């Protein structure tokens, strides 16, 4: 039969009725007098749902262009399909109906950056939520920017002092690298980042204006009460004048959580482009990858491993590559990134964890087994790498850091032999007790950053045996006794001269002999 | 009534499509079905784009024909809140299911609302003594915080939450709201009789002197109802916090059932599934619930949310997402419950933000950290005790083994509610006494 070829329809489109109704409703003779909705610069919402709106129209919209619904909520045009535009929603999608108008704004996504952003608890879109008014001394730059090239960078030289003894000796961090703090839940990651912020408050009042570090903390997917406690803490220490709090919490919409580290990186790149130094902590980057996974899976993109999209490596790559040490022709600024990736029961062979480990230079693996051994911070010293190495390590700390790494390397292999109490060797016992001295030396209470000169003196006093006479159980207070009972001149000249000179290593060699240790 | 009376278009299990001729309702609004056997409340979840909403039904859809007229209420699901709800059992749409007449309603609040903002948050850290030794020692509960009781399928998180109700909920002074999200109906009847016999629920005309409101959407209910009963318990608790302005308790049982009900619904909305089989919008739905359970400046909601883990798997995404929203976490393990220890709190995985040397004192903090250190050094030697035996260890290691075996038995405690089946009378321990004992 000749009718069978036209039996079943072969559609090249889905919203065919939406194209037919733009040509049949003018065929009514009474509806030719401007009875047509324009779709050149406007757009009608076809289907809302789950924080995803699909908009018919928007012919002149750009990919990644921030559009605005007529309800007031904004949105980012992400999928530019052949017959509609898949628009994510930056807020609650309860305010959107089918048939609402979408007014595009012509702007790729913008956040207020500048010197007036300091101390402002803002979202991943730019609105402050701390209740201190709008942003005043700011300017509106792009969210997604191109990373600096190969000309625009120089070598990572100057160190970024953390204040934590387990990381400033073993895993040193220079001003301009990307150092990952990877661990499990409740292992000390956010606390290490907060110590890295509070040490900048302790440091910035001793250095000039060109050497100050302005922190930016990006809380993605956390609670609102956690960011409230952190704002209370940074105000109680007074470090809010150096800190920007970008906060897209768990109540906030999924594209806000997706764009929070990008917004924070744009707010922290202002100090990098103006010769200052910046420090950004993309806290809970795995929750940002989860928010991007949800935003893509509702946008009908084909999923891959663990139902993530393909370009989720690119998602963290183009975010982390904006952290660099610029050359002197471009201002000499720096941005030191600190991603935080949570693993689940130690599976480091996951997808997002391997991607962020493959991107970043260093890694700080905090383990939940050594957290409950009393070793706080829970730094696994074997797996932690720092690929600047001794190029940006503090001099003086470099004189004892090789000894610390080698002695802890022997103490890591002396294990599985200490469970036989009569099996004395008198040489593996010496390194076995020396490793306990060095391990319990590197403990710190939280929210207590130690300056780098006192760290160098305190680890010098332990790698040279000046706390070797005490027991293994009293080194947490003998450390404080060694810090207090020495002359204040030793730290005062060690911070200034830059290294342990031969004109100092005979002074504090004897100043450790006039100390009182609580054990003999 | 041609406009604003839509008809049912299609039905896929608990997912009902209504097609309208004009004025589609807003998302998260409640619809009513005309001529159904029970009062079947739909709730719009999407807009399908052909003048068609995609509704979640709060009751069974058995017996829905694709011609049934559906009216719009023009509002979300609104429950009767106020002081008059004290002592009533409510389902997901605010009806009384305890057969004591209608609910004395001060106001009619919807269940969909925005979370309180950043500036309305309170930053307070005061302890909540519960009488259990492991909770008051190793992970002390914040008074006005969030508490998760992890562990699954017979570890005792429903016994522990009855012990927490029996301990804290009578010595509190403020109100209480129990929101049973998908637990057993028998357990709800047991709690109803046990709260009548204890005096925190009264019947008759003296109903207002009671101090506990029950909201039940228990595990017989379809997945439309279990996805919304936590929000109803939140609306009832948020009226007391936001308007009455006083501190409450909110014991939500099996908050995994909220995520599971939304996963049963989101299989049939045609969304692409995420990791192991859950919905893509897990974290945002759980955030939009769990950020409403917060202590503001005017009041406090002290929540103890039992979290069921699936097949004892903490790397499952439905509890691993929930781990970020909790202040004090109390992980229960079956490897300790098979050792006879009760309550089976895992001491080396259950944490809290209250365990800080500035808050609870350096004595309590150092005792808790020493207990965790002794148990962890015991846990490192477990294979050596397994294959090589106790007769080759060091002296200090076979002293820490004995100290750890003493504190593992010592962390166990007989409960005030568990004596119905165990015979041993329950012991409410004070805080300083168990600190001194450890």
């Amino acid at each position: 039969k000749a009718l069978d070829e036209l039996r079943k329809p072969k559609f090249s489109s889905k919203y065919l009725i939406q194209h037919v109704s733009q040509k049949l409703i003018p065929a009514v003779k009474e509806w030719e007098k401007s009875y047509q909705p324009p779709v050149i610069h406007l757009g009608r919402v076809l289907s809302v749902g789950d924080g995803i709106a699909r908009v018919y129209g928007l012919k002149s919209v750009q990919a990644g262009e921030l559009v605005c619904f007529d309800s007031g909520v904004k949105g980012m045009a992400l999928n530019l399909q052949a017959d509609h535009v898949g628009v994510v929603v930056f807020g609650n999608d309860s305010v959107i109906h089918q048939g609402d108008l979408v007014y595009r704004t012509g702007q790729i996504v913008n956040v207020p950056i500048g010197p007036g952003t300091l101390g402002r608890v803002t979202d991943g879109l730019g609105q402050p939520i701390d209740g201190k008014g709008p942003l005043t001394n700011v300017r509106s730059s792009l969210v997604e920017v191109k990373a600096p090239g190969i000309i625009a960078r120089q070598s990572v030289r100057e160190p970024l002092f953390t204040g934590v003894k387990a990381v400033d000796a073993l895993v040193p961090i220079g001003r301009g690298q990307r150092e990952l703090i990877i661990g499990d839940r409740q292992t000390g990651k956010t606390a290490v980042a907060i110590d890295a912020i509070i040490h900048q408050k302790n440091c910035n009042e001793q250095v000039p204006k060109a050497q100050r570090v302005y922190c930016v903390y990006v809380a993605v997917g956390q609670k609102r009460s956690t960011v409230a406690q952190l704002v209370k803490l940074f105000t109680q220490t007074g470090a809010m004048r150096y800190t920007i709090m970008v906060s897209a919490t768990a109540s906030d919409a999924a594209p806000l959580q997706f764009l929070a580290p990008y917004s924070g990186c744009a707010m922290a790149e202002y100090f990098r482009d103006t010769g200052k130094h910046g420090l950004i902590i993309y806290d809970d980057l795995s929750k940002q990858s989860v928010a991007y996974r949800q935003m893509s899976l509702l946008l009908r993109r084909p999923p891959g491993r663990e139902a993530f999209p393909g370009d989720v490596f690119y998602l963290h790559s183009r975010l982390l590559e904006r952290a660099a040490k610029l050359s002197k022709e471009l201002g000499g600024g720096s941005l030191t990134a600190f991603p935080v990736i949570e693993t689940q029961a130690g599976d480091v062979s996951a997808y997002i964890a391997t991607n962020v480990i493959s991107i970043t230079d260093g890694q700080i693996f905090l383990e939940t087994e050594l957290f409950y051994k009393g070793i706080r911070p829970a730094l696994n010293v074997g797996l932690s790498v720092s690929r600047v190495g001794s190029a940006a390590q503090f001099p003086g700390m470099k004189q004892v850091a090789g000894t610390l790494k080698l002695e802890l390397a022997q103490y890591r292999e002396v294990a599985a032999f200490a469970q036989f109490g009569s099996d004395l060797d008198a040489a593996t016992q010496y390194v076995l007790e020396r490793g306990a001295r060095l391990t319990e030396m590197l403990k710190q209470k939280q929210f207590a950053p130690i300056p780098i000169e006192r760290q160098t003196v305190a680890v010098y006093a332990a790698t040279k045996g000046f706390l070797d006479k005490v027991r293994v159980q009293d080194i947490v207070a003998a450390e404080e006794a060694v810090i207090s009972q020495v002359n204040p001149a030793v730290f005062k000249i060690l911070k200034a001269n830059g290294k342990i000179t031969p004109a100092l290593d005979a002074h504090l060699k004897a100043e450790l002999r006039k100390v009182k240790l609580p054990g003999a | 009534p041609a406009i604003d009376a839509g008809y049912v278009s299609q039905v896929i299990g608990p997912v009902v499509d209504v097609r309208f001729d004009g004025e589609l309702p807003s998302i998260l609004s409640s619809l009513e079905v005309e001529g159904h056997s029970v009062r079947l409340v739909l709730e719009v979840a999407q807009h399908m784009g052909d003048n068609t909403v995609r509704c979640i039904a709060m009751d069974s859809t058995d017996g829905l024909v694709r011609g049934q007229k559906v009216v719009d209420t023009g509002s979300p699901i609104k429950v009767p809140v106020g002081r008059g709800t004290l002592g009533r059992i409510m389902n997901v749409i605010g009806e009384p299911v305890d057969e004591q007449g209608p609910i004395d309603a001060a106001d009619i609040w919807s269940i969909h609302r925005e979370a309180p903002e950043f500036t309305e948050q309170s930053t307070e850290q005061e302890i909540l003594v519960t009488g259990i030794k492991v909770v008051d020692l190793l992970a002390p509960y914040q008074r006005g915080g969030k508490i998760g009781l992890f562990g699954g399928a017979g570890v005792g998180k429903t016994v522990l939450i009855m012990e927490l109700i029996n301990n804290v909920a009578k010595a509190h002074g403020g109100f209480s709201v129990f929101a049973g999200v998908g637990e057993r109906t028998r357990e709800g009847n047991d709690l109803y009789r046990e709260m009548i016999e204890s005096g925190v629920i009264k019947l008759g005309a003296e109903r207002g002197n009671s101090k506990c409101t029950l909201v039940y959407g228990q595990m017989n209910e379809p997945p439309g109802a279990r996805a919304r009963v936590a929000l109803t318990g939140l609306t009832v608790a948020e009226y007391f916090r936001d308007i009455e302005g006083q501190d409450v308790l909110l014991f939500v049982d099996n908050i995994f059932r909220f995520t599971q009900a939304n996963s049963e619904v989101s299989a049939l909305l045609g969304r692409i599934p995420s990791a192991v089989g859950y919905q893509p919008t897990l974290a945002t739905d759980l955030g939009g619930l769990q950020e409403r359970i917060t202590t503001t400046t005017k009041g406090s909601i002290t929540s103890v949310q039992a979290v069921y883990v699936p097949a004892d798997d903490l790397t499952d995404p439905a509890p691993a997402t929930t781990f970020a929203h909790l202040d004090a976490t109390t992980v229960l393990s079956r490897s300790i419950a098979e050792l006879g220890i009760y309550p089976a709190v895992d001491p080396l995985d259950s944490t809290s933000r209250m365990l800080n040397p500035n808050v609870i004192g350096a004595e309590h903090y150092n005792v808790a950290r020493g207990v965790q250190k002794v148990l962890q050094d015991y846990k490192n030697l477990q294979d050596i005790i397994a294959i090589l035996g106790m007769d080759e260890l060091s002296e200090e290691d076979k002293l820490t083994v004995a100290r750890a075996r003493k504190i593992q038995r010592f962390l166990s405690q007989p409960f005030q509610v568990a004596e119905v089946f165990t015979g041993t009378p329950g012991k409410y321990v004070d805080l300083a006494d168990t600190i001194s004992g450890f």
Binding site: A345, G346, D347 | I387
Partner: peptide
Amino acid sequence: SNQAVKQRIRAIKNI
């Protein structure tokens, strides 16, 4: 964690 159980199997078999 499906490499750690294989390494634990190999250590237990060597023991």
